Amino acid sequence: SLAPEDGSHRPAAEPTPPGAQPTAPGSLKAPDTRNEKLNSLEDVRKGSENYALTTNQGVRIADDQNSLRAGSRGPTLLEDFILREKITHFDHERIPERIVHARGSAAHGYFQPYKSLSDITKADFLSDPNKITPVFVRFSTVQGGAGSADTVRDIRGFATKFYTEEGIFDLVGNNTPIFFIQDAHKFPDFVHAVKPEPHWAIPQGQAAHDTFWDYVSLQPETLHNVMWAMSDRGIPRSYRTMEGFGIHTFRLINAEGKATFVRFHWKPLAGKASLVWDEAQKLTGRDPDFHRRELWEAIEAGDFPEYELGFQLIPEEDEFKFDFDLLDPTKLIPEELVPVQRVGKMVLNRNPDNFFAENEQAAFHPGHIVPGLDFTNDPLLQGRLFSYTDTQISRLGGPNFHEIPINRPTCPYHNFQRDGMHRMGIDTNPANYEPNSINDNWPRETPPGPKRGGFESYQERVEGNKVRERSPSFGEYYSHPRLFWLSQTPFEQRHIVDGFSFELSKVVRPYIRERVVDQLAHIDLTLAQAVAKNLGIELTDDQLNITPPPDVNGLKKDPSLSLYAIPDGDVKGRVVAILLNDEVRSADLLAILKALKAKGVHAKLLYSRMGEVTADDGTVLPIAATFAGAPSLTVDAVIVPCGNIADIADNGDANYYLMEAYKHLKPIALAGDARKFKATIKIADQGEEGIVEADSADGSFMDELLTLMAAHRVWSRIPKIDKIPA
Amino acid sequence: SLAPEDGSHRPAAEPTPPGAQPTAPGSLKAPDTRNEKLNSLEDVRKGSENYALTTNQGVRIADDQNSLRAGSRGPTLLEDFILREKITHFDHERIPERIVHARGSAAHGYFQPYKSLSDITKADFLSDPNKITPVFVRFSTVQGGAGSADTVRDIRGFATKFYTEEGIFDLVGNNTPIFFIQDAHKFPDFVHAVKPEPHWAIPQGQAAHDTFWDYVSLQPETLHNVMWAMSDRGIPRSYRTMEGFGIHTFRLINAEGKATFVRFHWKPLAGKASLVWDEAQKLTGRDPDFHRRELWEAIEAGDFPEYELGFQLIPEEDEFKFDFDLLDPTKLIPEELVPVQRVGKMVLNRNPDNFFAENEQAAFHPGHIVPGLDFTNDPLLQGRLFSYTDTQISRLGGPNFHEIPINRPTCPYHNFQRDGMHRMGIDTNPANYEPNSINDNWPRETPPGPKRGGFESYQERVEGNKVRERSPSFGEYYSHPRLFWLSQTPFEQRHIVDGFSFELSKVVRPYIRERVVDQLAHIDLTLAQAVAKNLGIELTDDQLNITPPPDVNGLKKDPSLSLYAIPDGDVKGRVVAILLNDEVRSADLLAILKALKAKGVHAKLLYSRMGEVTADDGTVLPIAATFAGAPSLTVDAVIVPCGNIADIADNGDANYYLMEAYKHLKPIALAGDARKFKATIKIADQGEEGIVEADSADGSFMDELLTLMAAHRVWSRIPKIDKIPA
Numbered sequence A, B: 001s002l003a004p005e006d007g008s009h010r011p012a013a014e015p016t017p018p019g020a021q022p023t024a025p026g027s028l029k030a031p032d033t034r035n036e037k038l039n040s041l042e043d044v045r046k047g048s049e050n051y052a053l054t055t056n057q058g059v060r061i062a063d064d065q066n067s068l069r070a071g072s073r074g075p076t077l078l079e080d081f082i083l084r085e086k087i088t089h090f091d092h093e094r095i096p097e098r099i100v101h102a103r104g105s106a107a108h109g110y111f112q113p114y115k116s117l118s119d120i121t122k123a124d125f126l127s128d129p130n131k132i133t134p135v136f137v138r139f140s141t142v143q144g145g146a147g148s149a150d151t152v153r154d155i156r157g158f159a160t161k162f163y164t165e166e167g168i169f170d171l172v173g174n175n176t177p178i179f180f181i182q183d184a185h186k187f188p189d190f191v192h193a194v195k196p197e198p199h200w201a202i203p204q205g206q207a208a209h210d211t212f213w214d215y216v217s218l219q220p221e222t223l224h225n226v227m228w229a230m231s232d233r234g235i236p237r238s239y240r241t242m243e244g245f246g247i248h249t250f251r252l253i254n255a256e257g258k259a260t261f262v263r264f265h266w267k268p269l270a271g272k273a274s275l276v277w278d279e280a281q282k283l284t285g286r287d288p289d290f291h292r293r294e295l296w297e298a299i300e301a302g303d304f305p306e307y308e309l310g311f312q313l314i315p316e317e318d319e320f321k322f323d324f325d326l327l328d329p330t331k332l333i334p335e336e337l338v339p340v341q342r343v344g345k346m347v348l349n350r351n352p353d354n355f356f357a358e359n360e361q362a363a364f365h366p367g368h369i370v371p372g373l374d375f376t377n378d379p380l381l382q383g384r385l386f387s388y389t390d391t392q393i394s395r396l397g398g399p400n401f402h403e404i405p406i407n408r409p410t411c412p413y414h415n416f417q418r419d420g421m422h423r424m425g426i427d428t429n430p431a432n433y434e435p436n437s438i439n440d441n442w443p444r445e446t447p448p449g450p451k452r453g454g455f456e457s458y459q460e461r462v463e464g465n466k467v468r469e470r471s472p473s474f475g476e477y478y479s480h481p482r483l484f485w486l487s488q489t490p491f492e493q494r495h496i497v498d499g500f501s502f503e504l505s506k507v508v509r510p511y512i513r514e515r516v517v518d519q520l521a522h523i524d525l526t527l528a529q530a531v532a533k534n535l536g537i538e539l540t541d542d543q544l545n546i547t548p549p550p551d552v553n554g555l556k557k558d559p560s561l562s563l564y565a566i567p568d569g570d571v572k573g574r575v576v577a578i579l580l581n582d583e584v585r586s587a588d589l590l591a592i593l594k595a596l597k598a599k600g601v602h603a604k605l606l607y608s609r610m611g612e613v614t615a616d617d618g619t620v621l622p623i624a625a626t627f628a629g630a631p632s633l634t635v636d637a638v639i640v641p642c643g644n645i646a647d648i649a650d651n652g653d654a655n656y657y658l659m660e661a662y663k664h665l666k667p668i669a670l671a672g673d674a675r676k677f678k679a680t681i682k683i684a685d686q687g688e689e690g691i692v693e694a695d696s697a698d699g700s701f702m703d704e705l706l707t708l709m710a711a712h713r714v715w716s717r718i719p720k721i722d723k724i725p726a
Ligand code: HDD
Pocket: A087, A091, B098, B099, B100, B101, B104, B138, B139, B140, B156, B157, B158, B159, B172, B173, B174, B179, B183, B184, B187, B246, B247, B248, B329, B362, B363, B364, B380, B383, B384, B387, B388, B389, B391, B392
């Protein structure tokens, strides 16, 4: 037997903190976590233990180590069907990746509404607070391939498949409340401009190249979502710590037939948090799978991603009441004008079993709505409805992608559609058409009605000529980017400046940089000037005299647009690095771990080598990673306990660990003789807001560190970090 | 008309150094670089300037900014065929990536032999020194997807398609002279074990995870290629500075019918050069396209990648004269025992026009041989012959992938094969079968012969029973790894130890680390002890007493197995960072730039912002990048000229630039007051080997720095770097 006798190959089927056990398929890690969708997949889950190895035809294999040959040094024979089946399968493993959002990470979970919403919608999944709907969610980046890195600067996708009793509803959103373009006709142009350039296929996962900024400089409608992407919104800390938005205005339809306009929101119950650029870009090198890993391990730990679904509702009579068009997906609806009403809660509580079968093959599409919902004439949403059914014909091999197990509805589905590649369902209906008498016309149409009704489109009035023309109301491009700019804290504004400065410095053709800075002068001169100075461009007198755009219905700022202006911090699920030494003061470690445990914060024990170290009281401490192997980039704060500090005080990696954490605005805590590390990062003996220090690690020490962590980063340190060489 | 009036949007069609001009399609950058294959591609090359925008049916488009709707705020109409053609084409842009070596970078070039090899092979392309054969080469990594990073630790692929007058020959090799496994039947197991794990699809581009080292610990045949991947061979500086190997013993067949065993080699004329791990890993975040970029720009600069083809030749009578089986792809043939005979030169001198069309769709397959070459019974080679035709059926959409332009032969091809998806050729033969009388049996078979004859397999004798059995002669696993280890310099050995140590520290299940350390103890006790000490593992007395494996045919070392033991340095094509200040000594900068230009070394002028700076004498100096924008990871050396040093002396990024270059063993040269930076890297007054310092950049300053650049890195600095926090 190849397993170790102690059973240490196999993870415990209980929640455990990140790193404590090897990760495992969901159904093995959490066998008792169920929901109607998870259960329904049992027909296709395949075990392995105690079973014979076979071909795909069920023939047991005696020797899976050798090809069939004529003599043991002889040629391989064509009659080796075992070799050829295995190699043929392998040779055809790959399927086309998604045209956009190819890089993504997913989990199973459930949603339920807080109260019935039957006064505004007849959608069944929102009709009953005690009716649970399983979900499957995929989070993604946009530009890079399926093997690109997670912590790039990009917009993030947040797609939710709701397996309702009246059909699948897919809410296919992003983490910013607008898109870059107005009309779907332009999507291939925009996507080609952001994607790797076609001659050399560079750069991966980066908008920082000429063709993207060329498109931006020529299409000012892009500027709003570009401001979002250049802010710290572009580099979330975790999929758990970003917002979601459906972007488009949709309709809700109630049983009386009344339509209300709606925009959809997800509020992360873990709070909003992002990285800083230098950290994000280095993390794509040190751990290109960091968000994928963090999501999977939060779920294994019981730190389940939770989000609150929220609706901005606007009555039909108020369609034209703002100074922007509701159907323009480059405009946001400020929550100061239309509040987000809380609707329900979604909990992600199980990882998939096989990433390819469940994540790679999942198909989401915003056209998959249910009775009680409907579309609007938003010209971006209108073209998305064509694309998501079409692309699955090549990506998933044919028109039967709904029979791939992750995509299957859990409610009944019956119709007269037949055949297609890899057809699974065997229809027994004598009829494959309707109307028919030979099956008494089953399956039959259902009239629309208050519940369990057929889908009917809201009878919106259409009046105009057949035209390819952009609505004049869409031709305003600068006021929303300006509202966003003015809503950010001063440090968030600095990071926006630095985002544009860094990206445009990688554009080789200087005139493109100049044209972008001229667009910025149409938004805000302080922003335009700060970017120009980093690019060595001087604004012209004319540019300095551009009139700022109008306020948005009187608003000079809306703090809900900022990540940080209103505290919402939650430490549960975060992780602290603990830098060990070979004689750790076990009293410090007791106090540190007790306080972390009470707040659901995880620890990773690091040292200069792997294996174990023994603390002052004999406690054996297994080492999670070396200082170089698990860099500060990967944690939220660093604690250095007392002990034999001499052991690590001259270690370059341990000093660098602190210098990188300090540069990246993370809280650092130093107990006892670990305070000698203050010399490495400057710090007055008097101390610094953001560095916790004391004779020992105790109640008070841990309290201060935990309070720092609830504020996420130490923004006050920003002016101290330009001078530090790290 | 949106182009700048000055014409600065368009790169000059002449060779230009990296970063001087935007990069461009090959045929626009270097229109006069031609070869027979590049010329034959003219029938499918499509221009653009001065043409009307059309659908794919040739219909001019009036408004490519808008969908057709009913009213300019109304719904989009199904009758918009222009939108639907455009979005349908976008929706189906992606094809499946290659199952392995999905990440790769390619160029066109040509091959010519030094002399006729008619005495040993009747292969037409090797028959005449004046015969030029166009090639297309793709270099790749092995594990990561097409969107993964370039400078991972991995084996690299080096695949060459020779478009010969007697058919396509594809030499599909790697950058190490052996493979991980012995029998193709194991290829899916090995590849599954190294690829991202199947529950969560982590990690991308890394073998540093449990399932890879699990397989290694259980399959000792893997140890030899694992030693090479853990060495600095696994992290090449460039595709131009690595070796290539076809790995398998093949046969050469001459016109008298004599077979000679042959292994193929490519020697890089630029010399052998690798990164160090920290630098490689960080570079996968700061520039995940570093090797792709470097290859493209070398070619644009005229620094053409050049390689020398070499053969190791073994007479048929000497098949059994070595300690290892010639057919075993885990064994190398030491150059001390069988020298590489130089055969010809390949020069890559033009980039593709379109990466998808030429790179992504190119199909190489080692079964594509020509008369004059033949296979052996190597059991890994034998299974490869099945896989590369099979996998193109899905990857490239059918059996007509040879009609995709890049894959087309330039010589005649005619046969009786018909139809298949995407069939381009319209056959006019009345017959689609042979023998036929209705076309007088054309096209006709051709007897074998000395030139232009049909392919016949060498009549090797086969004798044996039909078995799935590994030859006993393959059952030796440790001697070649030990020969590799003993052949390395001491700094190379240290890097091997650090490689294994880093990788195994990422293995979560400790018993696997233990089992690998046990395997290392079978190779070399010094290596096993040093890895064990880094993992906190103590060898047992049994392990300490394992007797070493025997020498390889009497060899205790072979220096051709080392990257660095025999100096082969070439600076041309390398790049230096020049860290500017706001009043540079122009005399220094004149001396520096001209000395670099004389040796073909490129420079990049860096500063704290973009735009220009003005030298002491008023010379305006354009800035290529900021210190953070183009990190030291991306250059071979760093020069800091004299001037107003206090301008950058306090700049964290400028100091960190030097500390990083220092840690990564790069030469650093400091002129005049730049010597103030010696305190940053802790250099003594009397200086140290590997730091060039003088009062000015004149006399021997540049000659010294170039002498350092020729030795690639300052290995003697390794003891001095462990203490620096960088
Ligand atoms: C039985 C399967 C099998 C085995 C044992 C190997 N390969 Fe392979 N290799 C493939 C099956 C395969 C493949 C699946 O057919 C690929 C992927 C897509 C393609 O066109 O070929 C491939 C791709 C591939 C590429 C990329 C070619 C390109 O750029 O398109 C290179 C350089 C190699 N291989 C080199 C090797 C070497 C040097 C091997 C051992 C000596 C080796 N392969 C063993």
